[PDB]
């Protein structure tokens, strides 16, 4: 079992990208399967578009600075670009491509692949961004800390016109995680203490909802919206995943992984559209079928966990099944 | 407690073959006991014939490519054979020995050890094959993906020629098994919701079963000795039973306290009599006919369940013994 | 007159490929003439595509194992590939290149020249196959004798996977052919009395024809372009015609003065019009439509017969041209 | 095309044995096919029983002296017998095994394989023999030249291992001899091949006398039909004559195609009458009439099929032609 260095969903949440120390793999979610794989080398960044057989591959250090775009269906190379320093994050929509270094942001047109803009920002060792995947509201947000209280300043940048729109005074402390909804309407931010989750409306700039997370301060790994912006998912070092309902404070529903799971695991999640599930097979505790929101939680140890949430009841969520990635 | 790497029944379901990173062990089912053990090294595949003191040893990486056949009664080594790639699966009957690799299938005569035929197949990353254990209808079935996804090649080991090709499923095949008499074949798709049972002689689809209301992958399928029941184990920690006389006939619910990071297989035995007086709390006619079901998981526990042949339903657990100890 | 070693039509029946003990020749059918010739050496297998200046060269023993692909217009060699055993047969379509050995079948991409797949088959000492020349329905068939005698494996060249197995005949297979569109299949046993036509899509027996009242082995089978007629050639110095619309439709009787130590192949072409004025002495309307039939024999003579699509019966002979001269 | 050194039918005429310079082959007649083959080396004598998977192989020199008997179904060796001199002929029935050297005849029991008898005969450079294949009338006949009394033949009974009578067959040396299937008759011919005589082995009286050809020419082999109706002689004239024993001049004659090389050994056999379709074959009409089939194989490696009209006789039509080498 080789070590894995990178996991993320696609922009719709129906696929899996993964990077090992020996290669990368691509999975699927509902009819689970292994679409692609190569045992080329160490990969640190494997990001995919809305299917479409387009990938961004960054070597473990193929150096960490180099970025390679590969079409998996054609097994060809669209392009190859180098950077002076190691790449920290890569994100895409169907219009723009963004590469972030520790102090620089590069924006590329996805089609022509020519460089469009460059932003000189204050250092971001954590490689934090958030990209709206829709071209109607294509926005990029990146933190702007003072260069050495106003440490949690974030810059709202419009990719369409390549000009910033506004500056949001998000938090007092440094930003730890950022997420933009599918339509590019909302943005959610998390401080380094992970106690307060704040979501802002990107066009107006007003803070709409504020969530309290857990009991004591602890690190936050990632944030992600639902497809319909109904729920927000956060995962932290407490080995617990919280769901906040944006249909409008305290977390709406909580995901407790099995006890045998290691505590030192990076956990990312995703929320899918509600589906029909049979209550005859699963004693939820009864009509034969009821809609339950499926949640997929893949951890850095290499396992996938499927949960269901009742939108009215909420509460602690039942776990249906567990696969094992890399097997 | 060393980690285990291989767990499997024998061709009759009356034994447990288990190989650890330190050695291998051979158990029994009804009179539970430790028949044999050796602390030699890491073993990846330990396959046994119908008792008869015959074993096949595959090293964890003894390499994974190398295959060794030993006799436990005489403590001797029959032969050793190497392969260009890692060994993925091995199955045996009283006439033929077959070794499956990533893209090749090797067929051996179990008596002489001479090579008989080699099949060039499209890649099988899951190491999937199924063998009829009876020499009367000695068949081999393996999937044929395109290089039309669930094509299964019914290969006749008796004359070393394929017999027919069945379009089993539209998607990838996940698990295949052949009955004890070699008459029927069962397969499950990669989405693990529909079970299809084929007549290996003609290829007609006979039975179709529903299972796995949500996305729970199917791992293993097994027939009973009389082929009356079909057992499917998935990743949902629940085992379904289908009757070959649609909806499942009976279900197995492992206790919740068990480790969830486990791989579970199962096998159904011939009906036996159980004593009520031995079990005062649960299951309380001094003796009743109940079909025994044995489920072993990778965490090292053997579970015994019993089902009422008429009522079915959720099955009780009589016992839970501890392998590796 | 150096002895010839190989005779074959092209995939359409409008050309002649012939190989001598001294070189190879390429003829034509309707305007009979010598298209090409080379005095290089002995050639045992000369196969041509649909014109396109592409040839397959196999040495007599260039050895029998080596295969050379040459372009006659550019006078250059595309590639040369060797094989462990002697080459038994070669067939082509516009997308795939197939080389058959005694126990193996090699499949190549006719464009990239890269090896695609290799099939392990039971020994075929006669070098038998049949290949569909149309890329749309590119199917390959080859016999599968036991190591159940007339089993032929239907192999899909497009996806490189077998599709189905048909129990063609109870005895050993003697000759096979596939129509131009790759839809139908024809087989003949070693008895030479029964001709069976199969549908590749389903596998059903479509037609059954009677032939060869005595022991005359069948040598070659060929479909017409429109698949209206099927011609079989044997060792009896007679060629029968069957209509795919029981008893044979028409028959060809070679002249008695010809050599008897001959192997004749045939290929039925598209119907054409013949001039009656050119032939006053035989067959006496100025012109009438007549289906041409071309029979070339190993003695070095090409024959042209014509059959009336309504009357059938014995076919008149128009011309007898001398190949190799 | 390898050089072939030996061709013989089985005792029933339904099979073909053959030996090349590289190995031996076994064919069949009605459903023609290659039952067996073996690429060992030069084989000089290949004799077979009534099918039953029993063969006798004599190497060209496996020296010419050595005799090896093999079961082809089991691919095993029964026994090997060595002799001081080269073997000239071997014939079998389901009871006895006979080995001829130039001056010695050895008789073995086919079952227990123990030696039974040995006859010291005057030299036979041509290795001539005729052996009855039926155990009810197991007889052996061999020539007895002096050391005018040249064509004397010794009638030897294999059952009791004693000579029965001496036949004063011909004035000159005997050239060929054969016995009917039931062991009742015997036919011999002198080295001139002008007179064919038939003697009854029971009494010794000459029954039939046939004239063959006009000028003295060599004779290769003589063979009866299975029903003892006809007798077949083959010679250097590239022509095969058939004499009707239902009772002088040959009843019907077989002419090979003119292309055939004239320096070819030819052995023939007559089969049981069967039905043929006159609709397909313009015999020049009832749809079917019974035609007696004759199979003629030549040393060049070809087989010829003729048909004989028992009433009309005359020159026989030829239906088909194969190749025994290659296929």
Author numbering:
A (entry chain A): 5 to 65, 70 to 156, 222 to 321, 409 to 445, 458 to 499
B (entry chain E), C (entry chain C): 5 to 65, 70 to 155, 223 to 320, 409 to 447, 459 to 499
D (entry chain D): 5 to 65, 70 to 155, 222 to 321, 409 to 445, 458 to 500
What sentences appear in the manuscript?
Autophagy-related protein 18 (Atg18) participates in the elongation of early autophagosomal structures in concert with Atg2 and Atg9 complexes. Atg18 belongs to the protein family of β-propellers that bind polyphosphoinositides (PROPPIN). The corresponding primary structure contains a series of conserved WD40 repeats forming the 6 or 7 blades of a β-propeller fold. The autophagic membrane adapter Atg18 reveals an unexpected structural plasticity in multiple modes of oligomeric organization.
In an effort to improve the helical order, we imaged the previously characterized Atg18-P72A/R73A (PR72AA) mutant that has lost its ability to interact with Atg241. The corresponding Fourier transforms supported the same structural organization of both helical assemblies, with an improved helical ordering in the Atg18-PR72AA mutant over the Atg18-WT, indicated by the higher diffracting layer line at 1/6 Å. D Fourier shell correlation threshold at 0.143 indicates resolutions of 3.8 and 3.3 Å for the 3D structures of Atg18-WT and Atg18-PR72AA, respectively. The helical symmetry unit is illustrated with alternating blue/white colors (pitch: 100 Å, number of units per turn 5.1; helical rise: 19.4 Å, rotation 70.0°). The T-interface includes R285 and R286 of the FRRG motif that are in direct contact with blade 6 of the adjacent molecule. The I-interface is located between blade 3 and blade 4 due to a 180° disc rotation a pseudo dihedral symmetry including in a small tilt of the two discs with respect to each other. Notably, four T-interfaces are arranged in the characteristic lozenge pattern that was previously observed in the COPII coat formed by Sec31 tetramers. In fact, the T-interface buries the PI3P/PI(3,5)P2 FRRG binding interface and shows direct competition between PIP binding and tube formation. Similarly, Atg18 phosphorylations in loop 7AB can be expected to affect the stability of the tubular assembly, in particular, as the higher resolution structure of Atg2-binding deficient mutant Atg18-PR72AA tubes suggested an increased rigidity over Atg18-WT.
